[PDB]
Symmetry: D3
């Protein structure tokens, strides 16, 4: 039985019950190669799927693409194939001045500025990670030597107006999002990304274990542009951390 | 001058194109571009494969959107930044009316907004409606191809599974909001389900951009939940011919 | 057999399945006399009902009164008597600089600033015209020689605060509607009226065909006042257009 | 100087600050003639306007048409012309078994199943009448000898699905309103009508005094009423609102 | 045979079908001792319950604590034991400039800025008092010599941000409540308190009679924190009125 | 200055930056006595305030009363006097069959079925605890010997309809909450209580650290009635745990 979007079978996964789920298809092989015996499984649309072994145990790496809609498909189809634990790694924009490029964020809860979360739970439901996964991510991120922040993530269905960017084609932001960045800042929100609300809400309400770790690639309050070196390091550290968090989740 | 954040192309790269064809699947991009003159690969980052081509002597961009409103909104915004004003979406859809067949075409006249990204451009009250010229061109292109064509309302969902009231899933549960929702839409005359039209049409209708949506029916939900891969290739060839002809009509 | 409000029977309509639905009871006779053998049927409250013949086929002309509630009654009761196609004609106020007095607007979709549309479909449902009816109206309007605008209409339950008028008794507009005209303007919305969201949503969700065409008789952005001869020419043009749209809908 | 829809001026109203606002333009003359010196002022669309004298003081009678949108126009324009008090009269259909044809309902509050109300205040604002107007209406209703019910009215933007009628073209009722009648019944709601939520919210949030009184002519729960009872109820309703107005004036 | 939170039995109430429900448990004894044969029944949490006699009939006096949640528990459990009439007395802040400290406000309707009302009826439902109770409270207040105002009350789940207080730890008010006080003021709203929306909605939708009378302890056009010097006298007046209101409801 | 409701000053607190906040006023002394030099500070309405010392540092114990509104006042006024960390302890009813009487729950996130949370942040914002507090609570709970569950809690503005109880005066539950217990159960929610949504949302959005730990007194899915010895043992255990959680937070 092949799942419709991902194009893999349960046999393909080789008993894996844990998935690492990056956003970018290009990141899948890189993560897989940090582990043992990486094996390319399939590539369809934004979904690149690999299998590898961590401490003897089969693990899946599967990209989600951008946004909760495409993430929700990947998570659902992997769950059909037996995956029960989902470790999200992705890039993020910080919105607090104390948070620097190269820092790591582990989401304790997400502002649900998406639509897909609502297809699993009403708005009142918290977009919260599994406590064990969040604990493992904090441990792995801190043990890596990175500066780590635990806190609330604003998770948006857009990269532009939902993150109150005005340097756009229309230069307009709809009423709902006018003044919204200052509002999140004052509420102590750490960062913007585009998948965590969907991921955390669907998993918390569906008996699946999930968490999110993110490397800070930009800070919206900072005028300085990060150099190539810092970005490469950040990207390398992010995937190292997610693999080590996965190691901590294995039993 | 500037390279857009995700698409990784410049305005110079597009060679003066003001119209884009925006399929969902990156693999479908080259297939669209080769139906036109002088296709050139521009960039491929994440779910975004960008080609340029020439249609009747005018530069046309072809760019994948990936799945869903959020991914789609990035592509449209960045293409608009580089001078694109008209967007023709082509994709696959599931029919919820029993009379619509696999292989039929649907041109969306309005979208039920079961997405979140549309709200990042306009309040829920705003209609998720296409540019009338694009919708007219798509209908005509679809008819002239020999296809059975349906004009009507499309339900546009941020999920493939529960928001389209699919029950063959890991939990087998559908949240309260969406229980009975397919039969609701059906009784209301809604033709089909897909995942990008509400975001695309709302975003464009509220931003001074022209947009439309044509889709190939790959499944009828009165039979089953998961689409057969057979007849999927056949449906996809017709769909892309229709959209290139629709683009031709738009360029005058 | 006799509908509750309209005071007509199925027999009274002589097999008509198309209705032209103006707002003002006073306009019904004027529209009906553009066609052949106009016959007065009933008059109760804001509902004046005529019958006429167009290219040999029976046509109904029925006023709706102001607002979606009154309109919803008329459309429902006509539908009970076999009417399937509804052509809304009126005069409207433009909010775009480029739209002049004497231009025609054909609605491609309505902003649902009403309440009655929610009695037929949740807010997510598009207040969209039937495509054939929209097509017939565009053709009739363009063939008349008028400049025709295809676009979005804001459809409000009030004439005053919902259209952000401050020239009022209180001079206040509720928070929801503060800054709303400029918001609609920036979004490309063409005009305000008060019935289309109800008509379009109810029909699009009930297996009925509907559309709206309106003549522009004032512009909220222009200080200059239109002269009498233009206003009456626009009103005359509006009703000729809708009758020709009806002709295009007969088969 | 002359309001946009009503086609009357402030001079036309002769200093009137109170208005009686029936729904049906045909009822306007019938209310006006209960007072002194009734004079037709204007008729445009569903707005028929008369002026009259009650105890030496000028009073305006103006039809609203059906629904909150048309009502909101009438009330606003009358307000521009100095009207500060609005008395709504009608006949209605009850949803409670204990409420009989011939009884009067005085609305103490409205379920806001409309849209125009939200153009004046957010949903959390109560669609509530002015206490003096409601008090005067109760007294006048009791003084007429009828059984009077004080309570909540469900105010709907539609006559059909918003009142959970299934005897319709589609025979469907949107999810929001499925089971709603039983819901309102169990919560003690007295009746359905179509204008009060808009009228009451608009006036309560704009410094205007308003209230609603209505004769019961049909009951959704009771299988039935005599023609003589119906015209008597209609006659009583407008007698009551005029006497309610007299109380308001002094 | 005791209710879960209140710790009273039906026998404890000695036939009472009317309750006076102040907020503060300290006002319970005071109110009871304005009547005959006051008897302490129970005290648990914020719920102090007394019995007394008014013109030979049993009345219950029971504190609600602060807010709709704790109020809802008290009303429900008293209803279970046979109470059908609930007279709320409390403190309030005026938002209109003409309303002075020491004045009495009888609520004709409540702005539902609470959450507990939604546990009884959808937002569309009016938070309206029983007419007889409101009439009795007006009469009691006017007959006592006090200055009385009848009108709309804004009923908030918070004392601070929901009543637009800025003299707080953060100094910040969430978007929803920014500018809200002036909005209520412009709309003719008289006062702020914290229980009436819950109480009135619950009772109006549950076949129970309820009303609210409140003594003005602060005018918000002046300041945010109530002066201590005037509380005692204002509270003395309030409880005098509610007891007289109760006398008028006895049948 | 002395805060309005609590009746205490900053000097009263003796430098305390951490508060333990039970619901019941009667629990305040019982918690304080587990620490050194407990001293009664004030008692007004439902707010009983004590000060104590834990490993040489000042700690405050303050009752909240029932529900978010009362809680919001206590948290805000303590925050004005320098309190930055809030540890909630209480009772709860489990809705999962696997959760036994005598077990403890540490809330990782709350379903916002309250009103007061909205006065601090829109519904999209997660009702989430501070991660260090939840970590400290889990550790303290485990080291006490009890079985601990980490998970989502449904936080309701009512005890009755919002927790889908039908054994009530009216015997009915508003549409919104019909079928809601089963919904939460299928979504993996552990329990119902009445304060966590407000507490966690206000603190997470206001730069305050907060968490919630609770003893399971009763299971909605079990028929077996828990022994008196069990219920008292769990009450005692809950407060020992929160004091230990406090110790972990201080150093
Ligand atoms: O600013 C950013 C950076 C990465 N991802 C986002 O969603 N936003
Ligand atoms: O059923 C379907 C088929 C294609 N695309 C969808 O979104 N749904
Ligand atoms: O301002 C005030 C005074 C008393 N009670 C309130 O809720 N607010
Ligand atoms: O079931 C319960 C038990 C304690 N507290 C609650 O709120 N609910
Ligand atoms: Na995508
Ligand atoms: Na009308
Ligand atoms: Na309380």
């Amino acid at each position: 039985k092949t799942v419709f979007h991902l194009g893999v079978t349960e046999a393909d996964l080789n008993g894996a019950t844990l998935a690492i789920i990056p956003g970018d298809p290009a990141r899948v092989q890189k993560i897989a190669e940090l582990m043992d015996n990486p094996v390319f499984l399939a590539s369809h649309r934004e979904y690149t799927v690999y299998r590898a072994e961590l401490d003897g145990q089969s693990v899946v790496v599967c990209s989600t693409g951008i946004g909760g809609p495409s993430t929700s498909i990947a998570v659902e189809e992997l769950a059909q194939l037996g995956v029960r634990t989902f470790l999200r790694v992705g890039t993020t924009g910080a919105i607090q001045p104390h948070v620097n490029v190269g820092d790591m964020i582990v989401t304790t809860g997400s502002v649900r500025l998406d639509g897909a979360s609502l297809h699993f739970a009403p708005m009142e439901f918290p977009a919260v990670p599994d406590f064990d996964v969040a604990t493992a991510m904090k441990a792995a991120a801190q043990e890596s030597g990175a500066t780590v922040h635990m806190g609330v993530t604003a998770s948006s269905d857009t990269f532009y107006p939902g993150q109150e960017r005005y340097d756009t084609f229309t230069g307009r932001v709809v009423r709902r999002f006018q003044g919204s960045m200052k509002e999140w800042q004052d509420m102590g929100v750490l960062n913007f990304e585009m998948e965590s609300a969907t991921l955390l809400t669907m998993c918390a309400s569906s008996g699946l274990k999930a968490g999110c770790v993110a490397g800070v690639i930009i800070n919206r309050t900072q005028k300085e542009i990060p150099d190539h070196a810092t970005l490469k390091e950040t990207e390398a550290r992010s995937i190292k951390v997610v693999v080590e968090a996965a190691r901590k989740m294995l039993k």
